[PDB]
Short mmCIF file of C-alpha atoms in Angstrom, two decimals:
data_model
loop_
_atom_site.label_atom_id
_atom_site.label_comp_id
_atom_site.label_asym_id
_atom_site.label_seq_id
_atom_site.Cartn_x
_atom_site.Cartn_y
_atom_site.Cartn_z
CA UNK A 1 92.84 89.84 133.20
CA UNK A 2 90.24 89.56 130.65
CA UNK A 3 86.52 89.19 131.89
CA UNK A 4 83.72 88.15 129.17
CA UNK A 5 80.07 89.32 130.59
CA UNK A 6 76.55 88.55 128.65
CA UNK A 7 73.54 88.91 130.92
CA UNK A 8 69.91 88.92 129.94
CA UNK A 9 67.31 89.50 132.07
CA UNK A 10 64.43 90.99 130.03
CA UNK A 11 61.94 88.94 127.79
CA UNK A 12 63.57 88.15 124.19
CA UNK A 13 61.62 87.77 121.48
CA UNK A 14 64.66 88.53 119.22
CA UNK A 15 68.56 87.66 118.57
CA UNK A 16 71.41 88.74 120.94
CA UNK A 17 74.66 87.70 119.75
CA UNK A 18 78.40 88.85 120.82
CA UNK A 19 82.04 88.58 118.99
CA UNK A 20 85.12 88.55 120.91
CA UNK A 21 88.67 88.42 119.94
CA UNK A 22 91.74 88.80 122.04
CA UNK A 23 94.93 89.19 121.63
CA UNK A 24 94.70 86.66 117.94
CA UNK A 25 95.80 85.85 114.67
CA UNK A 26 92.48 85.73 112.75
CA UNK A 27 91.57 86.02 109.04
CA UNK B 1 92.93 84.59 134.15
CA UNK B 2 90.28 84.26 131.86
CA UNK B 3 86.62 83.89 132.71
CA UNK B 4 84.01 83.87 130.26
CA UNK B 5 80.08 83.63 131.40
CA UNK B 6 76.87 84.01 129.78
CA UNK B 7 74.06 84.12 132.30
CA UNK B 8 70.31 83.93 131.31
CA UNK B 9 67.63 84.77 134.01
CA UNK B 10 64.88 85.94 132.09
CA UNK B 11 61.96 84.38 129.48
CA UNK B 12 63.87 83.41 126.28
CA UNK B 13 62.16 83.09 122.76
CA UNK B 14 64.63 83.58 120.27
CA UNK B 15 68.14 82.89 120.21
CA UNK B 16 71.04 84.01 122.25
CA UNK B 17 74.54 83.53 120.77
CA UNK B 18 78.46 83.87 122.41
CA UNK B 19 81.58 82.94 120.33
CA UNK B 20 84.89 84.02 122.01
CA UNK B 21 88.73 83.88 120.45
CA UNK B 22 91.07 84.44 123.25
CA UNK B 23 95.20 84.16 121.93
CA UNK B 24 94.52 81.51 119.17
CA UNK B 25 95.53 81.26 115.44
CA UNK B 26 91.94 81.33 113.25
CA UNK B 27 91.27 81.41 109.87
CA UNK C 1 92.07 93.87 132.75
CA UNK C 2 89.31 94.11 129.57
CA UNK C 3 85.95 93.82 130.41
CA UNK C 4 83.32 93.25 127.61
CA UNK C 5 79.84 93.16 129.32
CA UNK C 6 76.23 92.72 126.52
CA UNK C 7 73.11 93.97 129.16
CA UNK C 8 69.98 93.28 128.25
CA UNK C 9 66.62 94.27 130.49
CA UNK C 10 64.25 95.33 128.28
CA UNK C 11 62.16 93.50 125.85
CA UNK C 12 64.14 93.05 122.89
CA UNK C 13 61.77 91.86 119.53
CA UNK C 14 64.78 93.09 117.27
CA UNK C 15 68.83 92.58 117.13
CA UNK C 16 71.19 93.04 119.36
CA UNK C 17 74.67 92.58 117.81
CA UNK C 18 78.15 93.10 119.59
CA UNK C 19 81.62 92.29 118.27
CA UNK C 20 85.08 92.92 119.40
CA UNK C 21 88.77 93.03 118.86
CA UNK C 22 91.27 94.00 121.13
CA UNK C 23 95.58 93.40 120.48
CA UNK C 24 94.73 91.34 117.58
CA UNK C 25 96.09 90.80 113.81
CA UNK C 26 92.61 90.45 111.90
CA UNK C 27 92.30 90.52 108.34
CA UNK D 1 92.02 99.01 131.07
CA UNK D 2 89.54 99.31 128.68
CA UNK D 3 85.42 98.71 129.42
CA UNK D 4 83.03 98.23 126.87
CA UNK D 5 79.60 97.78 127.66
CA UNK D 6 76.23 97.75 125.71
CA UNK D 7 73.44 98.38 127.36
CA UNK D 8 69.74 98.14 126.34
CA UNK D 9 66.74 98.95 129.04
CA UNK D 10 63.82 100.07 126.80
CA UNK D 11 61.67 98.54 123.78
CA UNK D 12 63.80 97.65 120.85
CA UNK D 13 62.24 96.98 117.22
CA UNK D 14 65.17 97.89 115.57
CA UNK D 15 68.78 97.19 114.85
CA UNK D 16 71.25 98.17 117.85
CA UNK D 17 75.26 97.24 116.93
CA UNK D 18 78.27 97.93 118.28
CA UNK D 19 81.74 97.23 116.85
CA UNK D 20 85.09 98.07 118.20
CA UNK D 21 89.16 98.19 117.56
CA UNK D 22 91.47 99.03 120.54
CA UNK D 23 95.17 98.49 119.91
CA UNK D 24 95.09 96.22 116.70
CA UNK D 25 96.55 95.71 112.96
CA UNK D 26 93.07 95.11 110.82
CA UNK D 27 92.52 95.41 107.23
CA UNK E 1 91.83 104.27 130.25
CA UNK E 2 89.07 103.99 127.36
CA UNK E 3 85.34 104.02 128.02
CA UNK E 4 83.04 103.29 125.26
CA UNK E 5 79.32 103.28 126.13
CA UNK E 6 76.25 102.77 124.25
CA UNK E 7 73.24 103.68 126.03
CA UNK E 8 69.85 103.27 124.86
CA UNK E 9 66.50 103.47 127.48
CA UNK E 10 63.70 104.81 125.04
CA UNK E 11 61.62 103.27 122.12
CA UNK E 12 64.24 102.56 118.95
CA UNK E 13 62.19 101.47 116.05
CA UNK E 14 64.69 102.55 113.81
CA UNK E 15 69.12 101.87 113.31
CA UNK E 16 71.57 103.27 116.10
CA UNK E 17 75.22 102.46 115.04
CA UNK E 18 78.26 102.96 116.49
CA UNK E 19 82.10 102.61 115.24
CA UNK E 20 85.46 103.08 117.22
CA UNK E 21 89.44 102.89 116.43
CA UNK E 22 91.59 103.99 119.19
CA UNK E 23 95.56 103.25 118.53
CA UNK E 24 94.82 101.62 115.60
CA UNK E 25 96.43 100.94 112.34
CA UNK E 26 93.41 100.34 109.80
CA UNK E 27 92.78 100.30 105.95
CA UNK F 1 53.55 84.74 115.62
CA UNK F 2 55.76 82.95 113.81
CA UNK F 3 59.00 83.83 114.17
CA UNK F 4 61.99 81.97 111.85
CA UNK F 5 66.00 82.25 112.87
CA UNK F 6 68.83 81.62 110.52
CA UNK F 7 71.87 82.14 112.47
CA UNK F 8 75.68 81.67 111.90
CA UNK F 9 77.74 82.12 114.58
CA UNK F 10 81.46 81.67 115.20
CA UNK F 11 82.21 79.16 111.76
CA UNK F 12 85.24 78.96 110.35
CA UNK F 13 86.20 78.41 106.87
CA UNK F 14 89.77 77.34 105.70
CA UNK F 15 89.70 77.71 102.04
CA UNK F 16 86.93 77.50 99.69
CA UNK F 17 87.50 76.56 95.71
CA UNK F 18 85.16 76.59 93.16
CA UNK F 19 81.95 76.17 95.52
CA UNK F 20 78.45 77.33 95.77
CA UNK F 21 76.47 78.40 98.66
CA UNK F 22 78.61 77.57 101.16
CA UNK F 23 78.30 78.84 105.13
CA UNK F 24 74.92 80.82 103.53
CA UNK F 25 71.72 81.66 104.65
CA UNK F 26 68.49 81.12 102.03
CA UNK F 27 64.82 81.96 102.98
CA UNK G 1 53.15 89.67 113.41
CA UNK G 2 56.27 87.82 111.76
CA UNK G 3 59.70 88.16 112.07
CA UNK G 4 62.33 87.15 110.05
CA UNK G 5 66.23 86.68 111.44
CA UNK G 6 69.27 85.86 109.16
CA UNK G 7 72.31 86.71 110.90
CA UNK G 8 76.29 86.04 110.30
CA UNK G 9 77.89 87.16 113.56
CA UNK G 10 82.23 86.28 114.14
CA UNK G 11 82.76 83.96 110.90
CA UNK G 12 86.18 83.70 109.48
CA UNK G 13 86.83 82.76 105.64
CA UNK G 14 90.48 82.69 105.00
CA UNK G 15 90.19 82.59 100.93
CA UNK G 16 87.47 82.06 98.87
CA UNK G 17 88.55 80.84 94.71
CA UNK G 18 85.75 81.03 91.99
CA UNK G 19 82.94 80.32 94.24
CA UNK G 20 79.23 81.08 94.20
CA UNK G 21 76.84 82.63 97.37
CA UNK G 22 79.21 82.31 100.29
CA UNK G 23 78.15 83.64 103.31
CA UNK G 24 75.54 85.46 102.29
CA UNK G 25 71.58 86.12 103.51
CA UNK G 26 69.20 85.76 101.01
CA UNK G 27 66.19 86.08 101.11
CA UNK H 1 53.89 94.18 111.56
CA UNK H 2 56.58 92.79 109.41
CA UNK H 3 60.30 92.65 110.30
CA UNK H 4 63.27 91.23 108.58
CA UNK H 5 66.13 91.28 109.56
CA UNK H 6 69.55 90.34 107.32
CA UNK H 7 72.85 91.27 109.67
CA UNK H 8 76.83 90.32 109.29
CA UNK H 9 78.52 91.56 111.93
CA UNK H 10 82.44 90.63 112.80
CA UNK H 11 82.69 88.55 110.28
CA UNK H 12 86.40 88.13 108.14
CA UNK H 13 87.54 86.99 104.77
CA UNK H 14 91.00 86.86 104.17
CA UNK H 15 91.07 86.75 100.47
CA UNK H 16 88.24 87.06 97.47
CA UNK H 17 89.11 85.56 93.80
CA UNK H 18 86.66 85.49 90.89
CA UNK H 19 83.65 84.90 93.27
CA UNK H 20 80.09 86.32 93.14
CA UNK H 21 77.77 87.09 95.78
CA UNK H 22 80.67 86.45 98.74
CA UNK H 23 78.96 88.49 102.07
CA UNK H 24 76.30 90.01 101.01
CA UNK H 25 72.63 90.60 101.43
CA UNK H 26 69.57 89.97 99.28
CA UNK H 27 66.32 91.18 99.72
CA UNK I 1 54.15 98.75 109.56
CA UNK I 2 56.97 97.09 107.71
CA UNK I 3 60.39 97.48 109.08
CA UNK I 4 63.59 95.87 106.49
CA UNK I 5 67.16 95.80 108.59
CA UNK I 6 69.71 95.58 105.53
CA UNK I 7 73.03 96.00 107.60
CA UNK I 8 77.07 95.43 107.62
CA UNK I 9 78.88 96.00 110.71
CA UNK I 10 82.88 96.00 111.55
CA UNK I 11 83.22 93.56 108.81
CA UNK I 12 87.21 93.20 107.49
CA UNK I 13 87.63 92.27 103.37
CA UNK I 14 91.66 91.98 102.57
CA UNK I 15 91.88 91.65 99.03
CA UNK I 16 88.84 91.56 96.27
CA UNK I 17 90.36 90.41 93.01
CA UNK I 18 87.58 90.37 89.63
CA UNK I 19 84.65 89.67 92.08
CA UNK I 20 80.85 91.37 91.66
CA UNK I 21 78.61 91.78 94.47
CA UNK I 22 80.99 91.58 97.71
CA UNK I 23 79.71 93.10 101.09
CA UNK I 24 76.89 94.83 99.42
CA UNK I 25 73.11 95.51 100.59
CA UNK I 26 70.72 94.85 97.49
CA UNK I 27 66.81 95.46 97.82
CA UNK J 1 54.42 103.27 107.42
CA UNK J 2 57.53 101.56 105.50
CA UNK J 3 61.25 102.04 106.49
CA UNK J 4 64.24 100.47 104.74
CA UNK J 5 67.28 100.77 106.06
CA UNK J 6 70.69 99.67 103.83
CA UNK J 7 73.29 100.17 106.20
CA UNK J 8 77.66 100.31 106.30
CA UNK J 9 79.21 101.48 109.09
CA UNK J 10 82.68 101.10 110.27
CA UNK J 11 83.66 98.35 107.84
CA UNK J 12 87.60 97.83 106.28
CA UNK J 13 88.43 97.13 102.69
CA UNK J 14 91.90 96.46 102.13
CA UNK J 15 92.53 96.45 98.28
CA UNK J 16 90.10 95.93 95.67
CA UNK J 17 91.49 95.48 91.78
CA UNK J 18 88.88 95.11 88.86
CA UNK J 19 86.12 94.25 91.06
CA UNK J 20 82.50 95.39 90.62
CA UNK J 21 79.33 96.13 92.90
CA UNK J 22 82.01 96.27 96.21
CA UNK J 23 80.64 97.50 99.75
CA UNK J 24 77.20 99.33 97.79
CA UNK J 25 74.08 100.15 98.59
CA UNK J 26 71.63 99.25 95.71
CA UNK J 27 67.93 99.54 95.96
CA UNK K 1 132.32 69.16 84.87
CA UNK K 2 129.33 69.26 87.37
CA UNK K 3 126.15 70.65 86.08
CA UNK K 4 123.04 70.79 88.60
CA UNK K 5 119.38 71.49 87.53
CA UNK K 6 116.72 71.92 90.06
CA UNK K 7 113.47 73.41 87.71
CA UNK K 8 109.83 74.20 87.99
CA UNK K 9 107.97 74.72 85.31
CA UNK K 10 104.21 74.84 84.63
CA UNK K 11 103.04 73.76 88.19
CA UNK K 12 100.03 75.33 89.65
CA UNK K 13 99.05 75.92 93.24
CA UNK K 14 95.55 77.00 94.56
CA UNK K 15 95.85 78.34 97.78
CA UNK K 16 98.53 78.12 100.39
CA UNK K 17 98.20 79.17 104.07
CA UNK K 18 100.39 78.60 106.86
CA UNK K 19 102.99 76.71 104.82
CA UNK K 20 106.91 76.76 104.17
CA UNK K 21 108.81 75.86 102.02
CA UNK K 22 106.43 75.27 99.08
CA UNK K 23 107.52 74.95 95.52
CA UNK K 24 110.71 76.18 96.19
CA UNK K 25 114.36 74.76 95.13
CA UNK K 26 116.95 75.22 97.40
CA UNK K 27 120.50 74.22 97.32
CA UNK L 1 133.72 74.04 85.65
CA UNK L 2 130.42 74.18 88.04
CA UNK L 3 127.16 75.23 86.36
CA UNK L 4 124.18 75.58 89.00
CA UNK L 5 120.19 76.45 87.55
CA UNK L 6 117.56 77.12 89.77
CA UNK L 7 114.56 78.04 87.60
CA UNK L 8 110.96 79.04 87.99
CA UNK L 9 108.85 79.16 84.74
CA UNK L 10 105.19 79.53 83.96
CA UNK L 11 104.34 78.53 87.41
CA UNK L 12 100.90 79.97 89.09
CA UNK L 13 100.42 80.77 92.72
CA UNK L 14 96.54 81.98 93.44
CA UNK L 15 96.57 82.93 97.16
CA UNK L 16 99.54 82.72 99.36
CA UNK L 17 98.02 83.40 103.53
CA UNK L 18 101.05 83.65 106.34
CA UNK L 19 103.71 81.58 104.85
CA UNK L 20 107.10 81.34 104.57
CA UNK L 21 109.49 80.33 101.69
CA UNK L 22 106.79 79.91 98.60
CA UNK L 23 108.04 79.41 94.87
CA UNK L 24 111.32 80.91 95.81
CA UNK L 25 115.17 79.90 94.81
CA UNK L 26 117.48 79.63 97.61
CA UNK L 27 121.49 79.17 97.23
CA UNK M 1 134.57 78.68 86.02
CA UNK M 2 131.56 78.98 88.13
CA UNK M 3 128.19 79.89 86.89
CA UNK M 4 125.07 80.05 89.25
CA UNK M 5 121.74 80.89 87.47
CA UNK M 6 119.08 81.80 89.84
CA UNK M 7 115.73 82.57 87.59
CA UNK M 8 111.99 83.41 87.50
CA UNK M 9 110.55 83.57 84.14
CA UNK M 10 106.56 84.03 83.33
CA UNK M 11 105.59 83.40 87.19
CA UNK M 12 101.61 84.46 88.34
CA UNK M 13 100.88 84.85 92.28
CA UNK M 14 97.34 86.30 93.01
CA UNK M 15 97.30 87.43 96.34
CA UNK M 16 100.09 86.72 99.27
CA UNK M 17 98.81 88.39 102.85
CA UNK M 18 101.22 88.49 105.64
CA UNK M 19 103.74 86.09 103.71
CA UNK M 20 107.63 86.39 104.03
CA UNK M 21 110.33 85.64 101.04
CA UNK M 22 107.64 84.93 98.33
CA UNK M 23 109.04 84.55 94.85
CA UNK M 24 112.40 85.72 95.60
CA UNK M 25 115.84 84.83 94.90
CA UNK M 26 118.60 84.43 98.01
CA UNK M 27 122.14 83.76 96.94
CA UNK N 1 135.98 83.90 85.89
CA UNK N 2 132.60 83.82 87.97
CA UNK N 3 129.34 85.12 87.21
CA UNK N 4 126.36 85.13 89.05
CA UNK N 5 122.70 85.69 87.89
CA UNK N 6 119.57 86.72 89.69
CA UNK N 7 116.97 87.58 87.61
CA UNK N 8 113.23 88.67 87.44
CA UNK N 9 111.41 88.80 84.16
CA UNK N 10 107.48 88.87 83.51
CA UNK N 11 106.45 88.20 86.44
CA UNK N 12 102.68 89.07 87.98
CA UNK N 13 101.86 90.34 91.47
CA UNK N 14 98.42 91.01 92.67
CA UNK N 15 97.89 92.21 95.46
CA UNK N 16 100.78 92.57 98.44
CA UNK N 17 99.71 93.26 101.82
CA UNK N 18 101.68 93.15 105.25
CA UNK N 19 104.37 90.93 103.72
CA UNK N 20 108.38 90.62 103.15
CA UNK N 21 111.18 90.28 101.14
CA UNK N 22 108.52 89.46 97.93
CA UNK N 23 109.62 89.38 94.30
CA UNK N 24 113.41 90.34 95.60
CA UNK N 25 116.87 89.44 94.72
CA UNK N 26 119.62 89.35 97.56
CA UNK N 27 123.06 88.87 97.65
CA UNK O 1 136.95 88.51 86.90
CA UNK O 2 133.83 88.65 88.34
CA UNK O 3 130.35 89.49 87.17
CA UNK O 4 127.49 90.20 89.67
CA UNK O 5 124.09 90.92 87.59
CA UNK O 6 120.63 91.83 89.46
CA UNK O 7 118.07 92.43 87.66
CA UNK O 8 114.45 93.18 87.37
CA UNK O 9 113.04 93.14 83.64
CA UNK O 10 109.13 93.90 82.33
CA UNK O 11 107.74 93.25 85.84
CA UNK O 12 104.25 94.38 86.91
CA UNK O 13 102.82 95.14 90.53
CA UNK O 14 98.90 95.74 91.05
CA UNK O 15 99.20 96.87 94.55
CA UNK O 16 101.48 97.25 97.55
CA UNK O 17 100.41 98.01 100.93
CA UNK O 18 102.20 98.25 104.62
CA UNK O 19 105.08 96.15 103.11
CA UNK O 20 108.73 95.67 102.84
CA UNK O 21 111.51 94.95 100.43
CA UNK O 22 108.95 94.60 97.08
CA UNK O 23 110.75 94.09 93.72
CA UNK O 24 114.09 95.22 94.76
CA UNK O 25 117.85 94.47 94.25
CA UNK O 26 120.27 94.29 97.76
CA UNK O 27 124.14 93.81 97.30
CA UNK P 1 93.19 74.63 64.69
CA UNK P 2 96.03 74.68 67.71
CA UNK P 3 99.65 73.00 67.19
CA UNK P 4 102.17 72.37 69.80
CA UNK P 5 105.38 71.02 68.50
CA UNK P 6 108.72 70.57 70.50
CA UNK P 7 111.74 69.20 68.15
CA UNK P 8 115.24 68.08 69.53
CA UNK P 9 117.53 66.81 66.79
CA UNK P 10 121.11 68.26 68.59
CA UNK P 11 123.34 66.75 71.65
CA UNK P 12 121.28 67.95 74.84
CA UNK P 13 123.11 67.38 78.47
CA UNK P 14 120.80 69.85 79.79
CA UNK P 15 116.89 70.79 80.62
CA UNK P 16 114.64 71.80 77.65
CA UNK P 17 111.35 72.08 79.14
CA UNK P 18 108.01 73.81 77.58
CA UNK P 19 104.78 74.25 78.94
CA UNK P 20 101.62 75.92 77.48
CA UNK P 21 98.05 77.29 78.27
CA UNK P 22 95.05 77.60 75.80
CA UNK P 23 91.85 78.70 76.35
CA UNK P 24 91.53 77.41 79.82
CA UNK P 25 91.07 78.70 83.47
CA UNK P 26 94.11 78.06 85.50
CA UNK P 27 94.99 79.57 89.05
CA UNK Q 1 95.28 79.14 64.09
CA UNK Q 2 98.03 79.28 66.94
CA UNK Q 3 101.73 76.99 66.50
CA UNK Q 4 103.90 77.49 69.13
CA UNK Q 5 107.28 75.85 68.38
CA UNK Q 6 110.50 74.95 70.17
CA UNK Q 7 113.67 73.95 67.79
CA UNK Q 8 116.92 72.98 69.44
CA UNK Q 9 119.80 71.62 67.16
CA UNK Q 10 122.81 72.81 68.61
CA UNK Q 11 124.83 71.28 71.91
CA UNK Q 12 123.17 72.67 74.81
CA UNK Q 13 124.88 72.54 78.21
CA UNK Q 14 122.12 74.81 79.84
CA UNK Q 15 118.83 75.10 80.56
CA UNK Q 16 115.88 76.26 77.34
CA UNK Q 17 112.41 76.87 78.78
CA UNK Q 18 109.53 78.02 77.11
CA UNK Q 19 106.04 78.97 78.76
CA UNK Q 20 102.99 80.80 77.05
CA UNK Q 21 99.52 81.72 77.67
CA UNK Q 22 96.91 82.04 74.85
CA UNK Q 23 93.27 83.31 75.67
CA UNK Q 24 93.18 82.00 79.40
CA UNK Q 25 92.37 83.33 82.84
CA UNK Q 26 95.13 82.89 85.00
CA UNK Q 27 96.36 84.06 88.13
CA UNK R 1 97.30 83.45 63.59
CA UNK R 2 99.99 83.22 66.15
CA UNK R 3 103.32 81.81 65.61
CA UNK R 4 105.54 81.39 68.70
CA UNK R 5 109.24 80.09 67.55
CA UNK R 6 112.22 79.76 70.24
CA UNK R 7 115.36 78.20 67.65
CA UNK R 8 118.37 77.61 68.94
CA UNK R 9 121.38 76.31 67.00
CA UNK R 10 124.74 77.51 68.43
CA UNK R 11 126.34 76.05 71.74
CA UNK R 12 124.24 77.13 74.82
CA UNK R 13 126.21 77.02 78.40
CA UNK R 14 123.54 79.36 79.92
CA UNK R 15 119.93 80.11 80.21
CA UNK R 16 117.57 80.95 77.14
CA UNK R 17 114.04 81.94 78.80
CA UNK R 18 110.68 82.98 76.85
CA UNK R 19 107.38 83.73 78.08
CA UNK R 20 104.43 84.80 76.21
CA UNK R 21 101.18 86.26 77.40
CA UNK R 22 98.43 86.75 74.34
CA UNK R 23 94.68 87.97 74.41
CA UNK R 24 94.49 86.89 78.01
CA UNK R 25 93.78 88.05 81.44
CA UNK R 26 96.22 87.61 84.05
CA UNK R 27 97.41 88.52 87.52
CA UNK S 1 99.46 88.45 62.56
CA UNK S 2 101.85 87.99 65.60
CA UNK S 3 105.21 86.67 65.37
CA UNK S 4 107.38 86.42 68.01
CA UNK S 5 110.63 84.77 67.35
CA UNK S 6 113.71 84.68 69.97
CA UNK S 7 116.75 83.14 67.71
CA UNK S 8 120.56 82.47 69.13
CA UNK S 9 123.27 80.92 66.98
CA UNK S 10 126.32 82.01 68.75
CA UNK S 11 127.93 81.22 71.55
CA UNK S 12 125.78 82.45 75.37
CA UNK S 13 127.58 81.75 78.61
CA UNK S 14 125.01 84.15 80.24
CA UNK S 15 121.23 85.03 80.17
CA UNK S 16 119.50 86.03 77.43
CA UNK S 17 115.41 86.58 78.12
CA UNK S 18 112.01 87.66 76.32
CA UNK S 19 108.73 88.84 77.77
CA UNK S 20 106.03 89.65 76.02
CA UNK S 21 102.31 91.25 76.19
CA UNK S 22 100.07 91.55 73.53
CA UNK S 23 96.24 92.47 73.93
CA UNK S 24 96.12 91.48 77.56
CA UNK S 25 94.89 92.78 80.94
CA UNK S 26 97.84 92.30 83.10
CA UNK S 27 98.55 93.30 86.83
CA UNK T 1 101.23 93.25 62.10
CA UNK T 2 103.58 92.77 65.23
CA UNK T 3 107.16 91.14 64.67
CA UNK T 4 108.78 90.88 68.06
CA UNK T 5 112.30 89.73 67.40
CA UNK T 6 115.32 89.34 69.34
CA UNK T 7 118.43 87.87 67.69
CA UNK T 8 122.16 87.09 69.38
CA UNK T 9 124.93 85.79 66.83
CA UNK T 10 128.02 87.07 68.89
CA UNK T 11 129.68 85.79 71.89
CA UNK T 12 127.49 86.67 75.60
CA UNK T 13 128.82 86.68 78.83
CA UNK T 14 126.15 89.21 80.25
CA UNK T 15 122.37 89.31 80.36
CA UNK T 16 120.03 90.68 77.24
CA UNK T 17 116.93 91.36 78.44
CA UNK T 18 113.65 92.51 76.24
CA UNK T 19 110.46 93.38 77.59
CA UNK T 20 107.62 94.24 75.37
CA UNK T 21 103.52 95.78 76.14
CA UNK T 22 101.00 96.29 72.73
CA UNK T 23 97.95 97.06 73.19
CA UNK T 24 97.43 95.91 76.62
CA UNK T 25 96.15 97.33 79.97
CA UNK T 26 99.02 96.80 82.54
CA UNK T 27 99.57 98.08 86.09
#
């Protein structure tokens, strides 16, 4: 089981970025 | 089971980005 | 079981970045 | 079980960055 | 069980960076 | 108060031959 | 108060041959 | 108060041959 | 008060042949 | 008050042949 | 008297990705 | 009198990624 | 009288990544 | 009278990463 | 009268990383 | 001055091949 | 001055191959 | 002055191969 | 002045191979 | 002045091979 959560509750004036690779062949 | 959640409840004046790769062949 | 969480509750004027690789072949 | 958490509650005017590799072949 | 936590509660005007490799073949 | 965001997230480029200014940010 | 963000997150480039200014940030 | 962010996070480059200015930050 | 961030975090480069200015920070 | 950050954290380079200015910081 | 010629002379291949039986001789 | 010729002469291959049976002789 | 020739002469291969049976002779 | 020739002469290989059976003779 | 020739003459290999059966003769 | 000559005056029952690269960028 | 000559005056039942690179960038 | 000559006057039932690199950058 | 000659006047039932590198950067 | 000669006048049923490097950077 994979769970990927991004939560934002404050005040953002900038950049929030997320990147994920699970069980993959990437190049 | 894969669960991908992005939640936003605050005030956003910027960028929020998410990228995910699960069990894939990517290039 | 994999759990990947990014949580933001404060004031952000900068960059918050996350990168993850689990069980992958990457190059 | 792998748990990867990045938590921010203060005021950020700079860069907060995280990188993770678990059980992978990377080059 | 692996737990990787980065916590920030103060005021950051600089860079906070983390890098981790567990059980991997990296070059 | 002026904020400019130039972002590239989760894009795939297969093969690039004899090209200029590909997938770049210019300010 | 001026903030400029030039970001590259989670992008894949397969092969780059005889090219210029690929996947770069220029200010 | 001026903050400039030029960031590269979690990007993959397979092979780079006879190229210039690939995956770089220039200010 | 001027802060400049030029950052490289968790990037993979497979093979670099006869190239210039790859994965670098220039100010 | 001027702070400049040129950072390299957790980057992997497989093989570098006959190249110049790879993974470097120049001010 | 049986003569079989399978020849490859002066051929250029720029980039080959995820392919099978490229520029080969099979008898 | 049976003669079989499988020849490769003066061929250039720029980059080969995740491929099988490239520029080979099989009898 | 049986003569078999499997020959490789003056071939150039730039970069080979995660491949099988490249530029080989099999009898 | 049976003569088998498996030959490799004057071939150049730049970089080989995570590959099998490259530039070899198998009988 | 059976003669088998498996020959390697004047070949150059730049760098070999995590590979198997490179530039070899097997009978 | 470049002069490229291929001359055949005998009896040919096989293959005669010529390949030439002069002052070029080839891959 | 470059002169490249291939001359055949006998009886050929096999392969005659020539490959040449002068003042070039090849890969 | 460069002179590259391949001359054949006898009876050939096999392979005659030539490869040349003069003043070049090859890989 | 460079002179590269391969001369054959007899009966060949085998392989005659030549490889040359003069004033070059090869890998 | 460089003179590189390979001369064959007899009967060849085997392999005759030559490799030469003069004033070069090879690896």
